[PDB]
Amino acid sequence: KETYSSYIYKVLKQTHPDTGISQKSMSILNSFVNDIFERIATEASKLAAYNKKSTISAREIQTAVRLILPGELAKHAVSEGTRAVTKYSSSTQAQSSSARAGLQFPVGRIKRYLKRHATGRTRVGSKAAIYLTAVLEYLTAEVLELAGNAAKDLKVKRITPRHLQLAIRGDDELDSLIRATIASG
């Protein structure tokens, strides 16, 4: 269980610059990132084993994302992961992998965490981590955009867990994803 608060905050500022977020809301988003990560890492690793691979590559992350994410979320996320990997390889001057990939979330840490889920002699590809990092950032961004929107609609300045609730429960796919994810624990 890790901390993504700083990064989550950076994503919030890209989409709702003048909207704040409470510590209680941040705690829940941190749980969101961790829980989703675990579900995707767990599936990807299994997928590598069944396809007889010794490395969890972006192909597997993609397959997992498609099994775990509903409908439109899966396709947009796939678009995001793919785009990040492409950027990452296209632009090599930047010092940070997150920066090369155009991400706010931490690619390096996500690679490290991804390792714990790789059981055997199985390896984690750099691209697998970039793809995963992009997906988590994207999901987090969707929740934040919707929660920020709910706060604005209610004429308030800060995102609370109630706004997170309205955003998630009011969106069929996110609701489905979260309920399924909860069932997973």
Partner: peptide, 23 residues
């Protein structure tokens, strides 16, 4: 901690703002 199940009186949030160092 507070997890996703919480979302299923959430407006009673008196927690302080999340902030990062300006320095």
């Amino acid at each position: 901690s507070v997890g996703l199940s919480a979302l299923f009186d959430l407006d009673l949030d008196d927690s302080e703002d999340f902030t990062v160092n300006s320095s």
